[PDB]
Amino acid sequence: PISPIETVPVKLKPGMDGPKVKQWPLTEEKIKALVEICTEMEKEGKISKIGPENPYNTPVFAIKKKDSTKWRKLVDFRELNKRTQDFWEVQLGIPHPAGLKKKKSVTVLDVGDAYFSVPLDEDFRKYTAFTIPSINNETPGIRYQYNVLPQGWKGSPAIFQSSMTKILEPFKKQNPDIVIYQYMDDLYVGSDLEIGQHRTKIEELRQHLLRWGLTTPDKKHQKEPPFLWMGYELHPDKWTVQPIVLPEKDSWTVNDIQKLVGKLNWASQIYPGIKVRQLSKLLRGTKALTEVIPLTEEAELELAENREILKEPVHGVYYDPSKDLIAEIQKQGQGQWTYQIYQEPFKNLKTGKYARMRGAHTNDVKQLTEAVQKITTESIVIWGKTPKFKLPIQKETWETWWTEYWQATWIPEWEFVNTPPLVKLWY
Amino acid sequence: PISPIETVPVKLKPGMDGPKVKQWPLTEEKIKALVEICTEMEKEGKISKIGPENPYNTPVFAIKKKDSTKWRKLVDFRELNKRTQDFWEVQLGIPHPAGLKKKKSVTVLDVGDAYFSVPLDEDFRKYTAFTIPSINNETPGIRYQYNVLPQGWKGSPAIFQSSMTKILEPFKKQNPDIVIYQYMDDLYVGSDLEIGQHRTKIEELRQHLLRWGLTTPDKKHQKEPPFLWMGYELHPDKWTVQPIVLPEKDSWTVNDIQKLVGKLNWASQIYPGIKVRQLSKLLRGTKALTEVIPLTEEAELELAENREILKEPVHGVYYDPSKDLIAEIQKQGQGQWTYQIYQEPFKNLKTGKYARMRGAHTNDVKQLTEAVQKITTESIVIWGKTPKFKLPIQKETWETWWTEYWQATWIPEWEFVNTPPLVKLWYQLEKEPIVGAETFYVDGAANRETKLGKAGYVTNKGRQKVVPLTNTTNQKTELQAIYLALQDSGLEVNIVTDSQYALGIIQAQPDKSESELVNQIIEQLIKKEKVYLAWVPAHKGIGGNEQVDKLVSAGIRK
Ligand SMILES: Cc1cccc2c1nc(-c1c(F)cccc1F)n2Cc1c(F)cccc1F
Structure with a gap:
């Protein structure tokens, strides 16, 4: 409601200007969902309609939440992140715990709603503008800017950090063994307990957050089969x-x-x-x-x-924390995909494979989306950062269907390869 | 008239200042032309006199055409435009006729003096000051500044459309069955009412606009379909x-x-x-x-x-949203594809083609999938959804190919339509070295400086051939080698090459290339019963690299 808080002044990385990315064409179904979601956001004061004196733009998408209950708005802040957070990686950075990878179990909790309650500095709103598109270009496009910290913007967790560390204290004392790392909109909780004890400390954690205000979506493998x-x-x-x-x-x-x-x-x-x-x-x-x-x-x-x-x-x-992680994936056989993560060619920091065979969801694009989301989650765990993918697929096909099987709140950097690999059968 | 519209706050790029361009005094012939005009504009509020405290200026001209009975004031803003901030791009997306929905009645309305009716941000007015040059030296200096959207300024189309869109809402909020399309200074109104009940609405709209100061000269909406x-x-x-x-x-x-x-x-x-x-x-x-x-x-x-x-x-x-969208594609020639999208039997919504010049070697199927993709994107922009496809390819041909292609792919709902030509794979390579079949160790090589080369092979049975080639590259010879082997072998053959170039072109199962060599090779493979191609490391002395790579010394050596 009327919860006043001084705002943290956010500034772009000098030299650079706000983003101006083109909004991909969306299906009518997804447009309808966006306008419904967005209208609620506007009554709640979270977003505001803007005019033509605002030239900036950031892409928006609609993806289905768990179980396909109802739609979720996903803002693509890759460009804004590159223009800000790179220096909110310095000013308000969040240290990466080197033991999270050693844990025996790691749960991922969606803590994004927290943000919508912290107001965003007024001179920065302007840069979060986005356009819900129009079919066949019949109408202009509905235009909004954010009034509160948005969900996929790396500055949101950087600013909420204060409130997080505080809310979590009581729990880190009662549980010094459990490692807790925050990345964008997710909390990564790791322990060495038994899958039955662990899943127990997790809903213990869920209630601690809820006891203090934050929320978090529920499971399905316990009460309703x-x-x-x-x-x-x-x-x-x-x-x-x-x-x-x-x-x-x-x-x-x-x-x-x-x-x-x-x-x-x-x-x-x-x-x-x-x-x-x-x-x-x-x-x-x-x-x-x-x-x-x-x-x-x-x-x-x-x-x-x-x-x-x-x-x-x-x-x-x-x-080298000063370099980028590159991930290449190669369509292997039937339902199998291999991948390598590196920073310099032929010097793999890690290799893997993924597989859920073509039968139930015997789709290529669906598998590729799954392997991209698994390889990324892993990278957040091991290095605290996402990689840039080299996807073996046609650009337009990918831009058309990625958002149909995407279930994560972040989006990695990518690019497309057109030349076959002779790095194919060799693993 | 000037509307009680809210003005959109405008500003100059960071660290810039109003133009201070110089305007050549003009023929006193046109200095009176201007004064008459500006006097009428000033009377009407459009502009205002101020030059003492206004350190800026933009050049003003005057042009009159016999294709008229009066003059025309023209101002060159190109310098102010250089320093005016950016705006939300007006509209880099025009509708496509085929996506407009069947309406019973349409009526365009001209809204002419669009811009001069919309006020301009008080704080920005001073940067629009122009100066009218005196007769001769009798120059006190008569200068005006705009109070409305200037005819060639950078933010006028954007600020106009924005303002028009707000004027329209209290009106389309009361008239839900009417749909309205904005374009430049034209309003297109559409509805499903009987032409009688429609012209009544068009009139109300006209009166609505009239209260906001905008004039729709179109009495009755006299525009012509x-x-x-x-x-x-x-x-x-x-x-x-x-x-x-x-x-x-x-x-x-x-x-x-x-x-x-x-x-x-x-x-x-x-x-x-x-x-x-x-x-x-x-x-x-x-x-x-x-x-x-x-x-x-x-x-x-x-x-x-x-x-x-x-x-x-x-x-x-x-x-019509109640029916289905369908797109059919047929192969036209080589590299060319046509397609049509429709909801019914023989009245197309729209037509189109797709050609592929991706370098030169592509497969009939790869091209089809690409065509399907290009259509899909278009449908999503025009209709908001994807069509059902009718394609000249058998579910078996397709599946065999995607299942074995290194790239991941996708294609919505599609049904087979038997119509020649029909898409298919003219040949498949074996996946295992054939037994009993002769084995050709193929090699080629040309001299970059001299352009002379040779192509050859040595089989396990002691069969040998070497043919001299002139005006060639290491890639033509490498394919000439495979071509010679295909030419001297039986219906089942095993070929071994050092060349990744040649192995790739063929593995890609191409069909009607822009190279007769590859077409000559393709024509062979199709004629064969079983072909199996294998690759081994070029210059690391193998059987083929030691035997087939030494006979090429009958020219240049090392
Ligand atoms: C069936 C039909 C035929 C010719 C012109 C039509 C039309 N429907 C509209 C239309 C619309 F589709 C949405 C809102 C208001 C409308 F008038 N316009 C007008 C029109 C456009 F909508 C786009 C380009 C040109 C044009 F004339």
Whole structure:
């Protein structure tokens, strides 16, 4: 209501001006949802209609909340974040707890509604302007700016931090074992307890917040036998990187070894020091492909050796907090996607795989959206920052359907690749 | 008159100041022309006299055309515009006729003296000061400043539209069945009432506007359908593009081919079939504008054929939300696709094409999926939803391809429509080296400086060939090698290459390339029963790299 609070002065990173990003075309269904959501926001004083003397713009979208109960507005502040928070990464930064990754269980709670109660500095509102679009350009577009801290803007958590640390104290005392990290609109809660004890301290936490004002959405796998695992529980234990296999055979054909000399010639870029000296000689003749030719002992000595140089990682582990994390994904087989996170080529800080096979939701774009949201969540946990993805997909297809399976409140930076990878079958 | 509208607060870019441009005194012929005008404008409130305390100035001119009985005051704001802040871009989105919904009655209203009726921000007025130059030296200096939206200022269209939109609401709040479209200084009113009950509303609206100071000279709303807006010809129940008169010249300059292609594209949004493949190739020039780009012979059949389609005019219909949207696509030629979107049997909503010049090698399916994507985006902008597609491809062809393509893809609801030509994969590579089949170790290589190369192979059975090639690149030879192997082998063959270039082009299962070599290769594969391609590291001495890479020493060596 009328809860007056001095506002924290927010300023853009000198040189830079407010954002002016184009609003993607939305479906009528999503437009209707936006105008309904937005009209409530306006009665509650959260947003205000603006005039033409405001030239700025930031994209808006509509995504469905858990279980598809009802719609949720998702503001794409990537550009604004880059123009601000980069220096609200310095002035009001939030330290990243290096033990959160070691926890046995991590729950993610949506604490975004908190923000809507802290008023935003008046000279900054102007920059949060957004346009709910019009079908077929028949009407101008409804235009609003924010009066309170918005949800996907990195300055909101930077400013609410004070209120957070305070509200959480009583609980961090009663629970010194539990690690709590805030990222944008989510709280990441980790412990080493048993999945039954943990899930218990989490709703303990939910009530502590509620006891003090903040809210948080409820589960479905406890009272109403909801066929779903919607409340995020991750376990950074099972996290491992060993997709680099070598074919273990008894009957070696010319074809076989050729491929092996190949995979090994690529692997050679990651791990300097493994060579095919002896294998690249048993292939010196021009023999039929399908002609068994069981390795000379010298080869078996090189193959055996290599089978190992792999499991023993490189120096690599040099996470430069001054650089960006890049994530590449490759459509593997059927319902399987591999990925690598790095900062310099061939020096992987991490590799993985994802899979939920094409049957129930046998869609490509739906899988890709899922793998992008998992790889990101992981990165928030390990490094406290999101990566820039290199998505193997056509731009327009992706811009058309990403927001149809998106369930997260943040959006990572991305770009598209058009050239096939020869980094495909090698893991 | 001047409206009691609220003024939108305007401001100059950060750290700038009002213009101080210099205006050349003008012929006393036109100094009286101005005074008459400004006197009438001042009487009416539009402008006001102030020059002592006003350190700024913008040049003023005067132009009169016999195509009139009086003068016209013209001011060059281009310097003030340079220092005026940015505004919410007026409207970089015009509707498309095919998305307008069937209305029973439409009426455009001209609202002329739009801008001079809307007040201007008190604080900004001083930066609009112009100066009228005296007869000779008898120059006391007669200067005025605007109290309303100037005719060529940067924020006028935006501030006008905003103001008009607020004037309209207390009126469309009382009249829910009336829909209103704003464009420049035209109001288009639409409704589903009997023309009788409609003209009554148009009159009320006119009186409503009149109370806000805006005049709609259009007595009775005397505007004439068909309406001509943004190159469109709009009727009460159909729309079409304005007349397309393709010139008939003996010699065409690069500039004349553009305006030509321009019109042909514009007309394609409703005339099925228009082709632009050859009239567009021509413009592959580096420095030309008058270069007499000589029309070719294929580009000659095209221009004639489009002239034939433009023969009898075509019309498209409006949209009805209660029916379905459908889009059909058929393959036109090579690289060209056409499609139409409709709700019913034979009255298109809109037409269109899609061509692909992505470098040169693409697959018939990859192109179809792209076409589906381009249509989908368009539908979302025009109608707010996606259509059902009818596509010349079998669910089996498609699935085989996406399931094996490295990129992730998607395509809404679609049904098969048997109509030639039909999309399909002309050949598939084997996934396993064939047994008993001969094995060709293929190699090629050219000299960059000399442009002389050679292509060859050595099979396991001792078969060998080497053919000398002139005027070539390391990529033509690398494909010549694969081509020779395909030429001398049986119906099942195993080929091995060092070249990632050649392996990629073929793996992409292309079909009607802009390279006869790749077309020669494609023609072979299709003829084969089983082909299996394999790749091994180029210069790391293998069987192929030691045997097939040494016979290429019969020219340049090292
Ligand atoms: C069925 C029809 C035919 C010709 C012109 C039409 C039209 N409907 C509108 C229209 C509308 F679709 C929404 C609100 C008010 C309207 F008048 N306009 C006017 C019109 C446009 F809406 C867009 C471009 C040109 C134009 F004439």
